[PDB]
Amino acid sequence: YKLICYYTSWSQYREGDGSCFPDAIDPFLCTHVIYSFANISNNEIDTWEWNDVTLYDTLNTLKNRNPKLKTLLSVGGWNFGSQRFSKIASKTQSRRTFIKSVPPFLRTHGFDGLDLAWLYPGWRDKRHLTTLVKEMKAEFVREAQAGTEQLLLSAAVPAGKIAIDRGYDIAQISRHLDFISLLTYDFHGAWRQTVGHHSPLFRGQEDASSRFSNADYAVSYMLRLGAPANKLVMGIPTFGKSYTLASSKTDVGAPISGPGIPGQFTKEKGILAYYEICDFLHGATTHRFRDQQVPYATKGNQWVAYDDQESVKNKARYLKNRQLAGAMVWALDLDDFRGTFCGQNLAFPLTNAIKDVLAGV
Numbered sequence: 001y002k003l004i005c006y007y008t009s010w011s012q013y014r015e016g017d018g019s020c021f022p023d024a025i026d027p028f029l030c031t032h033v034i035y036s037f038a039n040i041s042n043n044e045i046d047t048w049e050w051n052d053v054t055l056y057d058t059l060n061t062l063k064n065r066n067p068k069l070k071t072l073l074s075v076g077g078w079n080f081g082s083q084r085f086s087k088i089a090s091k092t093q094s095r096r097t098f099i100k101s102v103p104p105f106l107r108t109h110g111f112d113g114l115d116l117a118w119l120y121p122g123w124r125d126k127r128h129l130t131t132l133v134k135e136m137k138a139e140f141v142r143e144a145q146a147g148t149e150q151l152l153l154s155a156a157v158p159a160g161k162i163a164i165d166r167g168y169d170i171a172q173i174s175r176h177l178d179f180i181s182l183l184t185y186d187f188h189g190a191w192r193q194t195v196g197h198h199s200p201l202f203r204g205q206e207d208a209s210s211r212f213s214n215a216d217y218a219v220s221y222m223l224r225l226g227a228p229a230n231k232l233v234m235g236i237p238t239f240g241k242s243y244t245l246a247s248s249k250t251d252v253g254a255p256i257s258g259p260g261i262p263g264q265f266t267k268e269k270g271i272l273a274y275y276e277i278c279d280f281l282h283g284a285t286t287h288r289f290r291d292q293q294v295p296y297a298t299k300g301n302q303w304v305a306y307d308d309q310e311s312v313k314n315k316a317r318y319l320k321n322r323q324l325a326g327a328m329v330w331a332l333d334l335d336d337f338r339g340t341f342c343g344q345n346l347a348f349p350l351t352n353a354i355k356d357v358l359a360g361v
C-alpha cells in the first residue's frame with residue numbers, strides 16, 4: 001500500500017503549537033511525503049516561500065533515517081490561479097520550458113518526483129493537461145537514462161463528477177501517472193447554506209439529487225473511467241469543516257449563516273485542524289451520520305463535520321476492499337502532529353490509524 005501524505009509550507013507560520021516544520025514528520029509514517037506547493041515563474045518550476053530551499057533540505061534529510069521514503073514536490077495549489085497553468089500548458093513553447101526545468105530543480109533539492117496540483121482545468125484545458133502529463137512523463141523517462149531512479153509523477157484530482165468530466169481525461173492521464181490522489185473531502189462547504197459533511201464515504205439516505213457527493217461515487221466513477229485501481233489513491237482529510245448555525249437546529253439540513261469561527265491556531269474561517277477539533281469536542285455534542293459513516297459535533301452556534309480515528313480506519317478498510325493503491329492524507333500539519341491535544345499522547349493519530357489498517361489484513 002501507498003500512504004501519501006501532504007505537508008504544507010505555510011504551516012510554519014502558525015503561532016505556538018500550530019507551527020509545523022518538516023522535521024516534525026515521523027520518517028516511517030508515510031510511504032511518500034509531498035511538499036505543497038511550488039510556484040511556476042519564468043515558465044519554470046520555482047520556490048514559493050522565502051525559506052523553501054531550507055525547508056526542502058529539512059524534509060529531504062528525513063531520508064537519512066528512512067532511505068526508502070519518497071518525497072515529491074507539488075506544483076500549483078489553490079493560490080496558483082488555474083489560468084496560470086492553462087497558459088503554460090496550452091502552448092508548445094511554454095510547456096517545454098516548464099517540463100525541461102522540472103528534473104534539474106527536483107534533483108537539486110532532493111525530490112523523488114513531481115505532483116501536479118492544477119486546481120482546476122477548464123473544459124478547454126482537458127486536452128492540454130493530457131499533453132502536459134504525457135510529455136512530463138517522457139521527460140522523466142529520458143532523464144532516468146542518466147543513472148538515477150526515474151522521477152515519479154503524480155496528480156491531485158478533484159472528486160466531484162462535474163470537475164472530473166470538465167477537466168480530466170482520466171483514461172489517458174492514468175497511463176502516464178504513477179498515481180492519482182483523488183480529493184475525496186470537498187463534497188460540502190458553506191456555499192450550501194445548510195450543515196453537511198464534506199467527506200462522507202456514502203450518500204445520506206435522507207436527501208438525494210446528488211448521489212455523486214460522496215467518496216464511493218467518486219472512486220467508482222474513476223475506476224469506470226479507466227483509472228486502474230493500482231494507481232488510485234483515496235484522499236482522507238485530517239481537517240474538519242466548520243459552520244455558524246443560523247438557528248438552534250443541528251441535524252440534517254440545519255440552516256447556516258456562514259462558515260465557522262476561525263481556529264485558535266489555523267486562523268481560517270470554516271476550517272479546523274484535528275488538534276483544534278479535539279479541543280472543540282470538550283463540551284460538545286457528538287453525532288455520527290450512520291449512512292455517510294463520518295462524525296460531526298456541535299457546541300454553541302458552531303457545527304463541525306470532521307474525521308476521527310474510527311472514520312479514517314473505516315475509509316482505509318474501504319479502499320483496501322476495493323484494492324486501491326492506498327490513501328492520501330491532507331495534511332500532516334492538520335493531524336495532531338504534537339500528539340498532545342487528543343487525550344492519547346500519540347503524534348499523528350489519524351495518519352497512524354490509517355497506516356495500521358493498510359499494513360494489516
Ligand SMILES: *[C@@H]1O[C@H](CO)[C@@H](O)[C@H](O)[C@H]1NC(C)=O
Nearest residue numbers: 039040041042043047048049
Ligand atoms: C510565483 O511566480 C509568479 C510568476 O513569476 C510570480 O509573479 C509570483 O510572485 C510568485 N509567487 C511567489 C510567492 O513567489
